[PDB]
Amino acid sequence: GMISYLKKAEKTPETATAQKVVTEMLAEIQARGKDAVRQYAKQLDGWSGDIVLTPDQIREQTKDVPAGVRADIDFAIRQVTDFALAQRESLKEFSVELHPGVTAGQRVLPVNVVGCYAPAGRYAHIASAYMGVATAKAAGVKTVVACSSPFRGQGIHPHVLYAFQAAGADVIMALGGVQAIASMAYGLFTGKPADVVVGPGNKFVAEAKRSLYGQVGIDVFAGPSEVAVIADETADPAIVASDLVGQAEHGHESPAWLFTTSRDLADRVMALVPELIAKLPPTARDAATAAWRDYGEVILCGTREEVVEISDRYASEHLEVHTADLDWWLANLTCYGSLFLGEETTVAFGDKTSGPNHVLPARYSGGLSVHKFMKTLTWQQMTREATRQIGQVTARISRLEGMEAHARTADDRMAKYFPNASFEMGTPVEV
Amino acid sequence: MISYLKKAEKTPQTAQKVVTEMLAEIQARGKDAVRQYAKQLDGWSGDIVLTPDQIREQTKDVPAGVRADIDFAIRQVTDFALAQRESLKEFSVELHPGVTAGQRVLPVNVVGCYAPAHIASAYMGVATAKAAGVKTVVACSSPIHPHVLYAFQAAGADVIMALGGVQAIASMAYGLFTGKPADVVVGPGNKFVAEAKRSLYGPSEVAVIADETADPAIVASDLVGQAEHGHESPAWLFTTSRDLADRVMALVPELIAKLPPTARDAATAAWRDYGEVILCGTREEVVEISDRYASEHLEVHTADLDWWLANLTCYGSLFLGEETTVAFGDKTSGGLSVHKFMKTLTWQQMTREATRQIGQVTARISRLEGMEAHARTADDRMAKYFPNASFEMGTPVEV
Ligand SMILES: [Zn+2]
Ligand SMILES: [Zn+2]
Numbered sequence: 001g002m003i004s005y006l007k008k009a010e011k012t013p014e015t016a017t018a019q020k021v022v023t024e025m026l027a028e029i030q031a032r033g034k035d036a037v038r039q040y041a042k043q044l045d046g047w048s049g050d051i052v053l054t055p056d057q058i059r060e061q062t063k064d065v066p067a068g069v070r071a072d073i074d075f076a077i078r079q080v081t082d083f084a085l086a087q088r089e090s091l092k093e094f095s096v097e098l099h100p101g102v103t104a105g106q107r108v109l110p111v112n113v114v115g116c117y118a119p120a121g122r123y124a125h126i127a128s129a130y131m132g133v134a135t136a137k138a139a140g141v142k143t144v145v146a147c148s149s150p151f152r153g154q155g156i157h158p159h160v161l162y163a164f165q166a167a168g169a170d171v172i173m174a175l176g177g178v179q180a181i182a183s184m185a186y187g188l189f190t191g192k193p194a195d196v197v198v199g200p201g202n203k204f205v206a207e208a209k210r211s212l213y214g215q216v217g218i219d220v221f222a223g224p225s226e227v228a229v230i231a232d233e234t235a236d237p238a239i240v241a242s243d244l245v246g247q248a249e250h251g252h253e254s255p256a257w258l259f260t261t262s263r264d265l266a267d268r269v270m271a272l273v274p275e276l277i278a279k280l281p282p283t284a285r286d287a288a289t290a291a292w293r294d295y296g297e298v299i300l301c302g303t304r305e306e307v308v309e310i311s312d313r314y315a316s317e318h319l320e321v322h323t324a325d326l327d328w329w330l331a332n333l334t335c336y337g338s339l340f341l342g343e344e345t346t347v348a349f350g351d352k353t354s355g356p357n358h359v360l361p362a363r364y365s366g367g368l369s370v371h372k373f374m375k376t377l378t379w380q381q382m383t384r385e386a387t388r389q390i391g392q393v394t395a396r397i398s399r400l401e402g403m404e405a406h407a408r409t410a411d412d413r414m415a416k417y418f419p420n421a422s423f424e425m426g427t428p429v430e431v
Numbered sequence: 432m433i434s435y436l437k438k439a440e441k442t443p444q445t446a447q448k449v450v451t452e453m454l455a456e457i458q459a460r461g462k463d464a465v466r467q468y469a470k471q472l473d474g475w476s477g478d479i480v481l482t483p484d485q486i487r488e489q490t491k492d493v494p495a496g497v498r499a500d501i502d503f504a505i506r507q508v509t510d511f512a513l514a515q516r517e518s519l520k521e522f523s524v525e526l527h528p529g530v531t532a533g534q535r536v537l538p539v540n541v542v543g544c545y546a547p548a549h550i551a552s553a554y555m556g557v558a559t560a561k562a563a564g565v566k567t568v569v570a571c572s573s574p575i576h577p578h579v580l581y582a583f584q585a586a587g588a589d590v591i592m593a594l595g596g597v598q599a600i601a602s603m604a605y606g607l608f609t610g611k612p613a614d615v616v617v618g619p620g621n622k623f624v625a626e627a628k629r630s631l632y633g634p635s636e637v638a639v640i641a642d643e644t645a646d647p648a649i650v651a652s653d654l655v656g657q658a659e660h661g662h663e664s665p666a667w668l669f670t671t672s673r674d675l676a677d678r679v680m681a682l683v684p685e686l687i688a689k690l691p692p693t694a695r696d697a698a699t700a701a702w703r704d705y706g707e708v709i710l711c712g713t714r715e716e717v718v719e720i721s722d723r724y725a726s727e728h729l730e731v732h733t734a735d736l737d738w739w740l741a742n743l744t745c746y747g748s749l750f751l752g753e754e755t756t757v758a759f760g761d762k763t764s765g766g767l768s769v770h771k772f773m774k775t776l777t778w779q780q781m782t783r784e785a786t787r788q789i790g791q792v793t794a795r796i797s798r799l800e801g802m803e804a805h806a807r808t809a810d811d812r813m814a815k816y817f818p819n820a821s822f823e824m825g826t827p828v829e830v
Binding site: 068069072073075076079082083086087089090091092093094096098099102104106107108109112122123124125126159215236238239242243245246247248249276280281282283284288326330333334335336338339340341342343344345346347348349350352353362363364365369371375376377378379380381382383384386387389390391393394396397398400401402403404405406407408409410412413416417428429430431 | 497500501503504506507510511514515517518519520521522524526527530532534535537539548549550578614615632633646648649652653655656657658659660686690691692693694698736740743744745746748749750751752753754755756757758759760761762763768770771774775776777778779780781782783785786788789790792793795796797799800801802803804805806807808809811812815816827828829830
């Protein structure tokens with residue numbers, strides 16, 4: 001019954017002045033198209049060079065990326081690709097017979113164009129650059145357009161650019177912020193408007209994606225990196241603490257949660273975390289100090305079932321499980337971004353997918369995966385014979401609804417397909 | 432090679448802020464506050480949650496012939512939804528040796544359905560959610576048209592509530608009366624209901640593709656069919672045949688004129704203001720157009736139906752061939768399907784051996800990104816699993 005907070009969030013988790021800026025910028029971009037984008041690039045980034053990169057510029061600007069660094073990025077990207085490919089196979093097409101003579105089915109096809117944004121900020125994961133691109137390509141999307149702002153006057157940060165290329169981007173553009181999102185959405189420079197745009201950004205990028213796409217633009221986890229660990233008495237406190245500190249270095253708002261049934265484990269982690277932080281270099285130390293302090297939580301529960309309940313409520317983007325009987329946890333947890341089962345894997349090793357935007361005040365729906373880039377289209381087809389029954393039912397129900405024209409769609413078919421037969425087609429609507 | 436033989440004459444012209452007040456009251460006061468708004472908006476001072484007896488009583492007047500019709504209609508949605516559910520598969524896969532990953536597929540716990548009209552608008556949400564395996568479906572309808580109430584029950588609603596508007600949506604969302612907050616609420620609603628759902632989790636088209644083999648009488652009747660809904664119902668004809676386009680453009684007014692008053696009025700306005708007839712040179716141009724307009728309901732009256740099924744890429748629901756038609760009913764809405772009510776959860780697990788490579792790749796990438804704490808999670812596993820190892824884990828971050 002009694003859940004026990006050994007450590008509480010000492011601060012609670014947003015002005016929408018982004019709304020004005022985006023409205024204004026989109027208005028301008030709708031008006032002047034490429035020239036407004038190019039001018040925004042100049043005013044905001046000081047950029048005067050080419051927007052669309054050529055295959056030669058790509059090779060040139062990545063030439064100084066060493067083989068060891070390239071092989072590591074290649075490896076990381078392949079982990080994503082291999083999972084996305086398997087996931088693509090998990091949504092099947094089918095046909096099914098319903099009422100005899102009725103056939104219906106689902107087609108599954110990738111969207112035509114996906115735009116991928118990489119903010120390439122100072123403290124960014126390279127995975128932010130390749131995850132969208134790799135996933136879209138593995139979904140079968142035919143055109144992936146990738147944007148990242150110029151790094152230091154030369155062009156796109158070379159690692160981000162290498163990642164874009166290695167992940168299979170079809171077009172790469174040196175563009176940042178709202179004007180990148182808008183250029184992708186409207187198909188500026190390529191003539192290929194994006195069916196969806198993905199990629200983490202500041203509140204302006206978020207707001208442009210919302211404005212242009214609605215819910216499908218804001219249904220991916222955004223905001224400070226999270227980590228949660230479920231642990232029982234078998235868990236190693238030194239590993240649990242390390243993992244929490246791992247994402248706490250992201251910045252002062254990064255939440256780090258431990259859910260446990262072991263008082264002993266909770267106690268040791270709570271003591272270990274500050275010690276681990278103190279041994280980080282300055283930027284990380286200061287970042288994690290604040291993050292652990294204001295957003296770090298430790299929750300001791302009596303039973304496994306209560307852990308599940310609170311974990312499902314918190315719905316961490318990244319959820320590690322360090323327990324005996326891992327099968328039970330996979331079977332019983334229901335809300336999270338992605339699950340890391342067992343001690344061996346860990347959050348830093350990387351996501352296969354990105355979870356939904358669970359911190360939205362729809363919380364379970366969306367995320368970055370192949371499913372985001374797939375359409376399911378439904379169809380039906382009937383023999384004449386099938387309509388004998390369905391025509392009747394439609395006419396009658398229709399006339400009960402007062403939908404006289406609907407009914408005649410059925411009358412006309414009944415007349416045409418069964419000329420020498422009469423049917424109870426309902427009493428016509430006079431009103 | 433594309434010409435509009437009939438264009439749309441206008442676009443929809445242009446409030447729902449009270450929500451905040453109703454909601455703020457409901458939040459602070461709960462059931463009481465909702466009960467308040469029941470008498471005040473619907474003249475209801477009975478119980479909200481109906482009991483099985485009430486449901487049987489209030490639907491006892493509904494004849495067995497009508498019930499059979501509705502049950503059948505529901506089955507044609509249910510049976511499709513059951514197949515569609517099985518199209519999203521759980522799986523496990525081995526990536527890099529010793530890396531296992533997978534996908535669970537889980538129905539949500541609770542769905543709320545609002546029915547404010549086609550009876551289909553009442554049963555589509557409920558039947559879809561039940562076919563998806565949702566264990567609790569709450570259905571609301573402002574006080575209840577016996578057909579709507581019969582539809583809820585026959586479709587498999589678990590709780591039915593005589594409740595309307597924002598009260599209904601907020602009730603289901605907060606889970607007042609039942610104690611079961613909906614993971615999502617669905618239904619057709621007014622702008623108040625629209626803003627209510629838009630706060631809490633935030634006209635019927637018809638298009639016909641026709642070639643020279645199409646019967647223009649049937650094509651006209653079908654366009655007329657959905658025009659009769661309101662004055663804002665769009666009815667689009669995409670065609671490669673001027674002959675059909677003219678004969679349709681000719682017969683539509685004559686069909687409208689023969690409809691009873693309300694429908695005549697509705698369909699006149701709609702056909703005038705929103706009707707479009709677009710002639711194209713090639714099948715490829717029709718596809719280009721159809722996909723741009725992405726009609727919610729798209730009929731195809733052509734030779735070579737397989738080609739259109741293969742090439743059309745944007746629509747809500749395809750009606751393939753002449754025999755079926757929009758009035759027969761959707762299987763899904765473009766949207767509402769079983770997929771809307773199911774979660775995908777992804778997981779990974781690794782052997783120690785897998786981390787030998789994955790951990791050192793991670794440590795090196797992490798340190799290049801300036802992410803020292805990240806790198807240390809890899810270091811710590813390497814030390815635990817491979818104690819005497821000396822792999823390249825990258826230079827520690829000093830900054
Ligand atoms: Zn991280
Ligand atoms: Zn209709």
